[PDB]
C-alpha cells in the first residue's frame, strides 16, 4: 500500500515539475512572440533576443533530456484517437466524455436487464422441465451447476 | 502501446526539424524581400510550435490527472463489443444452419 | 449424453452483475466527472475541446548537426539590418 501511494507521489511531482517547465517554456515564446513584433532594432534589444532564444533552446534541450530517463516515471502512461479528433474545436472537453459513458452506462444497463432476463428464461424452462419431465430433473440442476 | 518520453521525443525532433528548415530557407532567400515578412513569418512558426507544446501541456496535465476512468471505459466498451459480436456470430449461425434444417 | 460431471465452468471474473465501479475502487474519477451531483444539479458546464484548460495562460486565442548559435548570429544581422 505505501509503494503504491509513494510511486503516485513521485509520478505527480515529476508531472507538476513537467507542467511548471513547459508553462515556463510557453511564457518564453510569448516573451520572444512580443520582443519580435515590438523589436526596435537596438544592439541591447538584439542582445536579449539572441539571449532568450538561446534560453528557450536550452528549456527545450531540458524538457526533451529528463523525459527520456529510465529513471523517471513519466513513461507510465497511450492517448485516444477519437479525443486527439475532437480536442480542436474551441471548447471544454467535457461532452465528448459526458455523451460516451452516458453510451457505456446504456450499455451496462442492457448487459444487466438481458442477464436478468436469461436468468429467468433458464429458471423457468429448467421448473417446466423439471415439471412435465421429473425423470430429466436430476442432470437439470446439474446443468444449473454446470452453469452457475 | 506509446509512451510519452516517445511523444516528446518526436514532437522535439520535428519542432527543431521544422526550425533547421526555417533557417535553412531565410538563409537562401534572396535578400531583396523586405525583414518584416521574414519577422511575420518567424512569429507565425513560434505561435506554432508554442501552440504544440501548449497541446502537449495539456497532454502533461491529462496524464497528471491520469487511468482509472479510461480502464473502466475500455472494458465497458470491450464487454459491448464482445456482445454484439456474439449476437453477430449467433445470426451468421442461424442463417448457415437454416440450410442443414 | 453431453453431461459431464468432469466438465465444470466457473463464473466469468469479474461479473457483470456487481457494480463493477466500485470494484477496485474506481469511483474517485467517475464521482468527479460525473454527469450530475447527488442532488441531481449540474455540477460544471460542459464543452467539446482542450481551449478552456489554457484560458488561464496568457494570450487570445479566437481561433483553434545544427549550430543554435550561427543561426542566432544571423538572426542578429538580419535584425540590426
Redesign the interface.
Known amino acids: 500500500m505505501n509503494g503504491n501511494s509513494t510511486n503516485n507521489e513521485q509520478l505527480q511531482q515529476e508531472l507538476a515539475t513537467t507542467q511548471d517547465q513547459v508553462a515556463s517554456i510557453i511564457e518564453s515564446f510569448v516573451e520572444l512572440g512580443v520582443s519580435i513584433y515590438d523589436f526596435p532594432g537596438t544592439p541591447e534589444a538584439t542582445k536579449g533576443m539572441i539571449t532568450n532564444l538561446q534560453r528557450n533552446v536550452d528549456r527545450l534541450y531540458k524538457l526533451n533530456v529528463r523525459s527520456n530517463d529510465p529513471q523517471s516515471s513519466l513513461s507510465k502512461v497511450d492517448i485516444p484517437l477519437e479525443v486527439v479528433q475532437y480536442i480542436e474545436d474551441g471548447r471544454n472537453p467535457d461532452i465528448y466524455t459526458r455523451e460516451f459513458v452516458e453510451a457505456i452506462r446504456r450499455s451496462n444497463q442492457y448487459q444487466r436487464g438481458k442477464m436478468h432476463g436469461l436468468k429467468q428464461l433458464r429458471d423457468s424452462l429448467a421448473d417446466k422441465i423439471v415439471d412435465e419431465f421429473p425423470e430429466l430433473k436430476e442432470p437439470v440442476e446439474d446443468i444449473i451447476k454446470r452453469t452457475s | 502501446q506509446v509512451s510519452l518520453a516517445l511523444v516528446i521525443r518526436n514532437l522535439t525532433v520535428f519542432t527543431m526539424k521544422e526550425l533547421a528548415q526555417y533557417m535553412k530557407t531565410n538563409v537562401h532567400t534572396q535578400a531583396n524581400e523586405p525583414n518584416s515578412a521574414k519577422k511575420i513569418r518567424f512569429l507565425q512558426l513560434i505561435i506554432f510550435l508554442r501552440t504544440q507544446f501548449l497541446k502537449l501541456y495539456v497532454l502533461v496535465k491529462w496524464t497528471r490527472t491520469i487511468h482509472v476512468l479510461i480502464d473502466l471505459l475500455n472494458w465497458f466498451r470491450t464487454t459491448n463489443m464482445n456482445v454484439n459480436n456474439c449476437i453477430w456470430a449467433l445470426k451468421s449461425s442461424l442463417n448457415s444452419m437454416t440450410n442443414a434444417k | 449424453y453431453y453431461?459431464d460431471?468432469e466438465?465444470?465452468?466457473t463464473?466469468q471474473q469479474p461479473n457483470?452483475?456487481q457494480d463493477?465501479?466500485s470494484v477496485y475502487g474506481?469511483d474517485?474519477?467517475?464521482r468527479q466527472?460525473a454527469?450530475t451531483n447527488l442532488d441531481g444539479t449540474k455540477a460544471?458546464?460542459?464543452?467539446?475541446?482542450?481551449?478552456?484548460?489554457?484560458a488561464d495562460?496568457?494570450?487570445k486565442f479566437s481561433?483553434?548537426n545544427?549550430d543554435?548559435d550561427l543561426?542566432?548570429s544571423?538572426?542578429?544581422q538580419?535584425?540590426?539590418?
Open positions: 453431461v460431471p466438465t465444470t465452468y463464473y457483470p452483475l463493477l465501479i474506481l474517485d474519477i467517475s466527472v454527469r460544471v458546464k460542459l464543452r467539446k475541446s482542450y481551449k478552456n484548460q489554457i495562460l496568457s494570450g481561433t483553434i545544427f543554435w543561426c542566432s544571423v538572426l542578429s538580419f535584425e540590426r539590418s
